[PDB]
Amino acid sequence: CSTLDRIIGDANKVASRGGAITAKQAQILRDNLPVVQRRSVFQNQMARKEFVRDQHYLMSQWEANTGRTWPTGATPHHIIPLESGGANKWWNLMPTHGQSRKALPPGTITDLRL
Amino acid sequence: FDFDSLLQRIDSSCFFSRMGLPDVLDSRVILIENVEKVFVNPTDAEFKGYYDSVEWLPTSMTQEDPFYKVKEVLPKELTGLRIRVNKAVMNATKGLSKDKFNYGPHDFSLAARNGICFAFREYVSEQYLHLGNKWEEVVGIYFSGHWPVGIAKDKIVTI
Fold first, then answer.
1. A113: nearest CA partner in chain B
2. Is the CB of B105 less than 8 angstroms away from the CB of A111?
């Protein structure tokens, strides 16, 4: 299993009913976001603001692209976290019910398909 | 402070060329062998107990100066010098080997290139405004061919 496969597997265990990551969504994730770039604190704060600003558009696109209604009262979860370099894109959202090492320095690039 | 002397020093430098060689630096330096042993699989023997205490030096333009929390508007001259030292360090860091910066799925080459440009921009601010010598110490390690990655009390963690 790749890093991406394990993140997708873990995320699906906590997916809202009728909200699972689909085959299509998983392939788009693999294609659009195979390598991620660690964000600074400031870049993470701006990425969160961008999400608050775009999340209604991004939930409509989730509905239109997977052919499903957004599960009732579910919060949108980033599959690849923003802080890790996740995207504010419908294919990086999944609806949800609600150790030792220092974090990598900002600018670190990680290939998820290994 | 001689800015042109700094540009010719940057001009004739060999940045990152001595990464993982066991050279004598300041007694304040903790030398770790490679990116793996700093960032992916650290051990507190190689960190000499200080791992708990370490903060990575800035590796992005959006990060804060750990040494001086200068809120002041910079003189226009200084803005001009910072752009020129940045371009100087960008030209002295073309085509670095990726092998010494890569472990497994992790590529540290952008972090390192951002980090050295950050250190030189802040060094110029430091020397121009007479703020101290914290960045002078970090830049000395760069000039010796190493990568200072981290501050842990009065220690500098380096590859």
1. B105
2. yes
Q: A10 is written with which tokens?
A: 């873990």
| Total domains present in chain B | 1
Can you list the alpha helix ranges (DSSP code H) found in chain A? Answer: 3-13, 23-32, 41-66
Give the method used.
Answer: X-ray
Rounded (to 5) percent helix, strand, coil in chain B: 45, 10, 45
User: Is B66 a member of any domain?
Assistant: no
Neighbours of A21 (CB within 10 A): 20
Contacts of B105 in chain A (CB under 8 A): 3, 110-112, 114
For this experimental structure, what is the resolution in angstroms?
2.2
Helix (H, G, I), strand (E, B) or coil at A49: helix
CA angle B35, A108, B136 (to 5 degrees): 70
CA–CA separation, A58 and B97 (whole Å):
40
Judging contacts by C-beta atoms under 8 Å, the chain A residues touching residue B41 are 101
User: Which residue matches tokens 């020129």?
Assistant: B84
Which structure tokens are listed for A32? Answer: 């659009």
Tokens representing B30 are 């903790």
Alpha helices, H only, chain B: 3-11, 35, 76-91, 109-129, 134-143
Residue B65 resides in a domain: no
Instruction: Give CA–CA dist A54/A59, Å, rounded.
Output: 9
Interface residues of chain B, partner chain A, Cβ below 8 Å: 39-42, 51, 54, 56, 58-60, 62-63, 104-111, 114-115, 149
Q: Which domain holds residue B28?
A: 3-60+71-158
Find, among B93, B99, B110, B108, the residue nearest to B145 by Cα.
B93
**Token pair recorded at residue B49:** 């107990």
